[PDB]
Amino acid sequence: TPIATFVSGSPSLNTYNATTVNSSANAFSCAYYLQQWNIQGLLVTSLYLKLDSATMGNRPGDLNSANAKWFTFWVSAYLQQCNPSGIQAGTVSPSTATLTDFEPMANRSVTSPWTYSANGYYEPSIGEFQVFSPVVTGAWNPGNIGIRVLPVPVSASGERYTLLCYSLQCTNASIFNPNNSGTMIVGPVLYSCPAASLP
Amino acid sequence: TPIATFVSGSPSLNTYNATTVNSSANAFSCAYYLQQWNIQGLLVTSLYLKLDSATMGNRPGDLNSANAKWFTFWVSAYLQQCNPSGIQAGTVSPSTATLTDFEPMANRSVTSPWTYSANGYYEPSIGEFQVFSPVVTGAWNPGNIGIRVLPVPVSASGERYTLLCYSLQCTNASIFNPNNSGTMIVGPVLYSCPAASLP
């Protein structure tokens, strides 16, 4: 068809099956809801993200860990080969489309790639910047969330993949401090870029 | 079809038949031009807004009223049941589509709803933030317009609707002061989010 779609994640944001690594290299479980479109070669991506002190995992309490403000989330079309944030199998429409139809076209501003790890922290300092106010509860007080978002080339086992990288940038240290209970939801974050291929 | 469209409002921005309520709970007539797309479940909305001292209505001159800087505009797909800003009947294409095809999908970050009034002021403090420089004339000097925009759940008579809420945030007090004559146009403001349904 001229238009293909992909949907993945937890509509309730109550299943915490993806992964995000913060600037102190600490890995956490998170919830997400991902909706994507490939409209004749234009990739449109909608993303919600949620963290919850009760499900994210252990928060180290050393000063550096507790004061972390940035964390990275990766949307991938390569769920087995290059999937650092653990995007789940979802639903592609129509049946003749395949998830690789949702790869972004290569970023023409960046050609040195990130070497993929399962728990490595990558911090982009280039690209588009958006600003969100999050929905927070409890003692969590990150303030505004800045969002750096771009396609990034990623190398894994001699292959190159372009993924979508989101750097979520809290104004305040708060959510990675183990003394503070609460939750945070951000979205829907919209991002468009050229797709690698036509559907 | 895979794509449906809706167009409503005043192309000239010279018919002032919609309504906006400002932070002092004062209601004003405004002009708008609304163009929307439902592209296989992706809702894309383009909006222009205009205020004119000569057509907006009486501006109370108490300090609180005169110093108001924020005002809220509502795009609705429910023109009879939940239409706080008075969006006008328009044109849906194709003929097999219906305006409810333009409801946004529920915001997954917010589930406590706004109780609809015809003249109630609602102020979102969550969601995406955009920045526009307005087109102004006369003594109107709002400066930059910040725009908080998101889908919001709205309760009316036991039913729930998701609307698009725009909070337009003047840098300076100016346009609600009855001593100042002039006009302001902002747009085109673009906003995308998932639609509730496929066309």
Place this chain on the structure above:
Amino acid sequence: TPIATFVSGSPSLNTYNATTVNSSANAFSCAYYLQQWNIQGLLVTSLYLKLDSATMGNRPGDLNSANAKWFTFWVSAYLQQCNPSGIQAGTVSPSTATLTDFEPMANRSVTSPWTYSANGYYEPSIGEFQVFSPVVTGAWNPGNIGIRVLPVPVSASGERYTLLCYSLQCTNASIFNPNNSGTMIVGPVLYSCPAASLP
């Protein structure tokens, strides 16, 4: 078809065949990569821009020239009649579409037009503002790039055209100072607005 596409420019950003004029009225050669969609009357535009001290042309070294921070780039659907930035012939799909299918609908906030020159500097002070961090090399240190982007009406020989205008706004003076060698890439800059016509 319901969807038409246009692609033009240098995928490598290594062919410098377009033109940008900066705030000191100095003209430079630049590289670009332009991908556009007309989705049933919605115009979506993706743009990369690159400058390189080695290919941009002579940089005057008077204080005013060297300290220039803003420069304007024009995306046009009128490659012969109104093409101030020198957008190159490209590829329209399908074969039944024509490049004029990519004209933006008129900006409803602005009706006084710019008088086109081949080397005139136009500076918009109205419209949407985005923020990018650029990819830079060498001694180039512009810092963040603010981007004012909007459709603008342009008059040429009694005809009116709407073009897309991008004002790229460096934080620091740097890239127009002839003492500083280096390069800058910004993108992909995405911009949507209503199209003048259906494909």
